[PDB]
RNA sequence: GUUCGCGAAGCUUCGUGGACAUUUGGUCAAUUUGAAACAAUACAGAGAUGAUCAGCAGUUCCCCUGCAUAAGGAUGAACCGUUUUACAAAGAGAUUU
């Protein structure tokens with residue numbers, strides 16, 4: 425099992441290396457093939473449970489989130 | 503077209519008023535682009551445990567075969583990994599006011 429895992433990891437790194445090599449060309453990372461209608465847990469958001477609308481509700485939270493996300497764009501860029 | 507009445511020409515023929523009968527079918531339109539699977543090649547490859555092997559379950563936002571609430575599917579599939587805080591009390595030494 426461990427060996428299999430290791431192999432998988434190796435494969436993944438190889439893939440990454442390949443993409444790095446062919447970076448000047450536009451390249452997309454291959455997704456794990458689905459077996460019987462599953463979720464790719466990047467998109468969609470998985471089975472979300474609510475924030476639960478409370479009494480002392482303030483709208484700065486959204487702003488904060490946006491701010492947080494701004495930084496990650498920068499990271500992506502670099 | 504059927505016909506039951508009226509009006510003109512020669513029971514036969516035209517012109518009319520009515521009655522009869524009355525709204526089908528499509529969640530679909532014919533080849534690639536609205537989603538079938540096996541197969542094949544290559545590559546590995548078989549539950550515990552030292553090894554070999556049986557069977558049963560269990561969890562799941564995985565299913566298949568099965569008439570099935572039988573039974574069977576690699577022990578049917580994935581589970582084998584990650585694992586640092588409701589965290590306080592006492593003692594000793596050090597820098598800052």
Ligand SMILES: [Mg+2]
Pocket residue numbers: 577
């Ligand atoms: Mg068996």
